[PDB]
Amino acid sequence: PVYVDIDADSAFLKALQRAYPMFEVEPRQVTPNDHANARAFSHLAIKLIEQEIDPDSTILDIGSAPARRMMSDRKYHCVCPMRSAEDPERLANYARKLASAAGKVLDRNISGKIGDLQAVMAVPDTETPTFCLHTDVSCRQRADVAIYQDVYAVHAPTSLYHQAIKGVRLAYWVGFDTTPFMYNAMAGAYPSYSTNWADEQVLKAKNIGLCSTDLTEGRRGKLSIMRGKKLEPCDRVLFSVGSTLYPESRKLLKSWHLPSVFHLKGKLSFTCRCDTVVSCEGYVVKRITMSPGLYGKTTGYAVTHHADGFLMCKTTDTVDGERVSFSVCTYVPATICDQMTGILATEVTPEDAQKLLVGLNQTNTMKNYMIPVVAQAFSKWAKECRKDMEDEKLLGVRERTAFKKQKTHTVYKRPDTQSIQKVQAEFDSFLSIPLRTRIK
Amino acid sequence: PVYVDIDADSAFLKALQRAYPMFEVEPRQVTPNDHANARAFSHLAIKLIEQEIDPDSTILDIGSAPARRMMSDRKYHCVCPMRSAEDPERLANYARKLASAAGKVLDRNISGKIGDLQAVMAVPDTETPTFCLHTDVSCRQRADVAIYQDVYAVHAPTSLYHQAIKGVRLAYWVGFDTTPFMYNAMAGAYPSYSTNWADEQVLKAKNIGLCSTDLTEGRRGKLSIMRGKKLEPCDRVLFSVGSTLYPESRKLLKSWHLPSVFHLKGKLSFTCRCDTVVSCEGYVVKRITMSPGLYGKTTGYAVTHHADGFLMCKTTDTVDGERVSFSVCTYVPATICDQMTGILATEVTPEDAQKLLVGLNQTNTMKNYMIPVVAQAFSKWAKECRKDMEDEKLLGVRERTAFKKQKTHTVYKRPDTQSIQKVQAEFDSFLSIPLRTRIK
Amino acid sequence: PVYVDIDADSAFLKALQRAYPMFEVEPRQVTPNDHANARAFSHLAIKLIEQEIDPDSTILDIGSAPARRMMSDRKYHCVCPMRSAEDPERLANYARKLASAAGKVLDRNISGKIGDLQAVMAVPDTETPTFCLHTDVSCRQRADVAIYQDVYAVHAPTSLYHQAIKGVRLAYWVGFDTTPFMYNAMAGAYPSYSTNWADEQVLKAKNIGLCSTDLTEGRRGKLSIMRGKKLEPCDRVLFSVGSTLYPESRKLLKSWHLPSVFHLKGKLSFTCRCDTVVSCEGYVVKRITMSPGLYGKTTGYAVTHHADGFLMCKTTDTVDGERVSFSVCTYVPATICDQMTGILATEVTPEDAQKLLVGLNQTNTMKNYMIPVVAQAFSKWAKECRKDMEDEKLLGVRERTAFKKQKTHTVYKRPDTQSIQKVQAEFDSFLSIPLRTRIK
Numbered sequence A, B, C: 001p002v003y004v005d006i007d008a009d010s011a012f013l014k015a016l017q018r019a020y021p022m023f024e025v026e027p028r029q030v031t032p033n034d035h036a037n038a039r040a041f042s043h044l045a046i047k048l049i050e051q052e053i054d055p056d057s058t059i060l061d062i063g064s065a066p067a068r069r070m071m072s073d074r075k076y077h078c079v080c081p082m083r084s085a086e087d088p089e090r091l092a093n094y095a096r097k098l099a100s101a102a103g104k105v106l107d108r109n110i111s112g113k114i115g116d117l118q119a120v121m122a123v124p125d126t127e128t129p130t131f132c133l134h135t136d137v138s139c140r141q142r143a144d145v146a147i148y149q150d151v152y153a154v155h156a157p158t159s160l161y162h163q164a165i166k167g168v169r170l171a172y173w174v175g176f177d178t179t180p181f182m183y184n185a186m187a188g189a190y191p192s193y194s195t196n197w198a199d200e201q202v203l204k205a206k207n208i209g210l211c212s213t214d215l216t217e218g219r220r221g222k223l224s225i226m227r228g229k230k231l232e233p234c235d236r237v238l239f240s241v242g243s244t245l246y247p248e249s250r251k252l253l254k255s256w257h258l259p260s261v262f263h264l265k266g267k268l269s270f271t272c273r274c275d276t277v278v279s280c281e282g283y284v285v286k287r288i289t290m291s292p293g294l295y296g297k298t299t300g301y302a303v304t305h306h307a308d309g310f311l312m313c314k315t316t317d318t319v320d321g322e323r324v325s326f327s328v329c330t331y332v333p334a335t336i337c338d339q340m341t342g343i344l345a346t347e348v349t350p351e352d353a354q355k356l357l358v359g360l361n362q363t364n365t366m367k368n369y370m371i372p373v374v375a376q377a378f379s380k381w382a383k384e385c386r387k388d389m390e391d392e393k394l395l396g397v398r399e400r401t402a403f404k405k406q407k408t409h410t411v412y413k414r415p416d417t418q419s420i421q422k423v424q425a426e427f428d429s430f431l432s433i434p435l436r437t438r439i440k
């Protein structure tokens, strides 16, 4: 019986029961976290990780939070280099949790982490069997399973290779769904988990989940010195999970949309297969299985199965004040898309579409905070499907002179469709002094 | 009592009970697999195979996943050449499951596969009685029954001949229905099992089960250097089942719609009969019975019986941006097609057809993700029948000048019809070092 | 209590109870056969045969499937020449069934067929008392009763004469009803048993139970080199029962519509009477009683009694693309015809007729897959009856100038009418080496 922090009356519990049917979910609250769904899914994924793997295995935990995964009965190796401002707080939490259960729990080898902590505090470059300060590039101890607890700032191919050299059989990756990023979207929804992401340039917008603007009077004279004339996504993107803000890199995050099969040829060439074992409203658990040698041929395509609908809409917003049009992605629950099918056949206006949507939402299924844009996406999809209907062409014959590109303003992946996108598969090229006293 | 992965509340269970009436199906979930129906049907077909065949027989398992079919009480011989990227994972799973039940299950001859695995690891060219690295062309062990567990990249005539030489009495083949591919369609449906296939050229579409497009602005200038001017299917096709992507060859898969009776004349000439013993919403189980000698005369025709309706619709879509009209195939449940019969007699618009279809879907019978296409197919079939009504011709009199070819935009095979197409019947012409250590 | 394969909830069971009232039918499924009704009727007919005939008799079985009729307590003689591609697999099934019950069932004289099988395997030209490799023309052992288990490629007069010379008192024939073939139709229905037939030329149609076409664009230039300008039936016809495709010859199949009484004059002249003892939705059991000598005078006419209505409609279809009009035959249940009698009095359009048909079909009485055609037949029959009404002629006075033939486009035999058709009655003129090892 697994225990979950989410409130008992929350509907997301049911979704969790669908995401983890092999585990019995029991809700109870200890903290009123603004973001409880994400931690609940992470805990369930960790429990499934414990269940699936072989107990007689060494589990690498890259980007680890040592305090969380120390009460586990398995033998973990935490690899937490000091590359973020969050790391010192986690080291403090680990220190308190170690010197709060050292002599009161026996069957957890707590003295092992105690001695390893003393050793690493003494020598910063010592490879302890349960705690390592090195990076994934230069970690040392051989293991067989790797766990990525929501690590988003790392290059997937290089890290996978540098850990496959060490001998991992199979690595799991729990986190957010990468497809909205490989679609080149500006802002995101992840409505159930209350996590919204936005690009740096579109931060000062008005009508997205992640924005903040200021009221102005009738000045058409702000006269910016710098003129770009190209609103394209950039590398830096900011996530807001509950009340905590985290910066990610677009390239590093987008690199996690691994193909179904791929190869890593270097000094030692391995082959790998990646599949989604658990998916729930945006949170995914990928299973990249290591394999020595160079077997088979790779296609170069990545597949995503959308259990619930995906909606990439074209919305105008006042970014920094100026009206600009950009693409925003949204996740729509399966039932809402299911019931909004007959209506999505006519020439429907955004007003009528949004009225029907709120009437459909009754207890809420989807967050009402982001159904001015779902209605817009549905209206534009109806527009496109219609204009496609009475523009029926001829078999096997295009119209090339140079050929006409006609308008696509929204992408509506139905709650049972799958998306293939091309992704590269043939990967070829790959402490502080006061803190030492603070260790005690 | 057979045990099935699919959820208890899923309607597809009933279909399974219709597909396997001799077997009692009991539902329970161990994993939340995105694709559960396909594995369910595969397991049920394997249990049917165990029931039907003679226990005192040697069963060739070509393209085998040895881990799954090793717990069986029969004496299987797995043939798993390293021709796919998944094969290393299959060998790893076999190794773990062998060294996880070696000394705790007795009546399964586990030590046999243990010793045979050591033998093949030692000598890669040794034909062990339960495991081999060879290809179906060059396998050695004599047997009497062959099993094809969803093998899709192989030529049916050559493989059947090369195994019939070895002495198989009868070979079963469980897989997808090959009927849509001899119909020369671009995209596929298989709605119940959530498996959608698409051609190479139509991957970047908008309104099929398997597509992914990007929003673009008003640029009628993409100016492609290469101009084809012929939208015809090619050999490469991509399947997406659940979240896994599998590449298939159009010719190799199309070769599996074998005629009712056919002959294989070579050094030794055999005769064979192929029949569909199990069929459910697309999944089929063919029964090709070997027979030495040359008796009878072949018709050269292959029959598919459609328990549920088949729809070949002509849909426009913006592939890579450019709008073209291509053909998509769809499976419609028998109940929906049955209730939509009298309505399919009028001059019905796609709007009214889609509204009435979504009304008929109430709990869902068919997946609502693909009823803009079914409605269009029904409307066009009504159009064709209506035009066919008042164009009555004379007995035995054609109109040849060179004679008029008037248009069919959809093929609607009713849920009790049979479709025959001409297929060729007179078939005339026919490990790495680190993995070796990884075997332990 | 007869034991039947067809599903318990199916309506056809009721019809079966009407076809065999002397037998108690108990349903259950052992296989999910696509075609279960046909095998059900065949088994019921065989059991009726067992009850009717004298136990102290020798029963010839032409075109035998020895495996099926071996468990019977009576003494059969199977005559199964290698004249079809199905024969080898039937022999293999016979061999397995013989060497699967040789020493565990006693009161069936199994060792008899064992020894006779060894004898024929040794000498291919040996007339064993329970198995024979000769044809019906050149079979040897004298008997008194003959059975035709759905044998379809044989000339009825020649076979009947060559068996009556051997001394058969009476021969039964279980099969499909031959009236639609003597009516010169292109496509057939047999809706209850899900078996559809069609001529070679109309294979590539669109709107029959047996067709397969391909979508095309507006090319009115296919320019066939060969021009026939005549759409008439040919000898070759394709049957599709469930998922099984069988070829028949039109002349041989039409020869089975034997008259009520006929004579065979040769070296020995016999007299025979043919009658239908059991009829159900298309399946018939004829009972041809032999008699030595030349007694009585023959009328030369054959009568078929239609328990359920018969409909020959004139439908236009795109055969290979070209629109041509041909005749299709259909069986309509008695209840539907009875209820649609008042409506069949007015000028009714095909639209209204089909709407009332689907409304009458509610659970389904007749298969909805084929009620575009029944509606057209009913509408055109109503048109013919109407035009027949206000065109009253004078008593016994024709109008001959050469006399006017006016148009019949459908033949509607009511569910209590009988059809008389002229058929000729005065009939005047009439293994491999590896298989031998496979016998073991």
Ligand SMILES: Nc1ncnc2c1ncn2[C@@H]1O[C@H](CSCC[C@H](N)C(=O)O)[C@@H](O)[C@H]1O
Residues within 6 Å of the ligand: A062, A063, A064, A065, A079, A080, A081, A082, A083, A084, A086, A087, A134, A135, A136, A137, A148, A149, A150, A151, A152, A153, A154
């Ligand atoms: N290249 C790299 N190799 C190993 N760890 C890295 C890394 N880059 C960043 N990290 C670490 O990964 C952590 C991500 S924060 C995530 C912490 C924890 N997995 C959780 O989900 O709660 C950071 O603390 C950072 O120190």
Ligand SMILES: Nc1ncnc2c1ncn2[C@@H]1O[C@H](CSCC[C@H](N)C(=O)O)[C@@H](O)[C@H]1O
Residues within 6 Å of the ligand: B062, B063, B064, B065, B079, B080, B081, B082, B083, B084, B086, B087, B134, B135, B136, B137, B148, B149, B150, B151, B152, B153, B154
């Ligand atoms: N020509 C051939 N002869 C024998 N096996 C082949 C083959 N071509 C491909 N294969 C094997 O067939 C496998 C198909 S993947 C199918 C695995 C398993 N039957 C399942 O359904 O789960 C591949 O792993 C490949 O190694």
Ligand SMILES: Nc1ncnc2c1ncn2[C@@H]1O[C@H](CSCC[C@H](N)C(=O)O)[C@@H](O)[C@H]1O
Residues within 6 Å of the ligand: C062, C063, C064, C065, C079, C080, C081, C082, C083, C084, C086, C087, C134, C135, C136, C137, C148, C149, C150, C151, C152, C153, C154
């Ligand atoms: N002229 C002939 N004389 C005797 N048998 C013949 C024949 N022509 C064909 N046959 C046999 O008749 C068989 C018809 S298939 C019918 C099999 C069985 N009676 C059943 O209904 O299931 C063929 O196998 C063929 O071998």
Ligand SMILES: [Zn+2]
Residues within 6 Å of the ligand: A077, A078, A079, A127, A131, A132, A133, A134, A139, A140, A141
């Ligand atoms: Zn380390």
Ligand SMILES: [Zn+2]
Residues within 6 Å of the ligand: B077, B078, B079, B127, B131, B132, B134, B139, B140, B141
């Ligand atoms: Zn082998």
Ligand SMILES: [Zn+2]
Residues within 6 Å of the ligand: C077, C078, C079, C127, C131, C132, C133, C134, C139, C140, C141
């Ligand atoms: Zn004989």
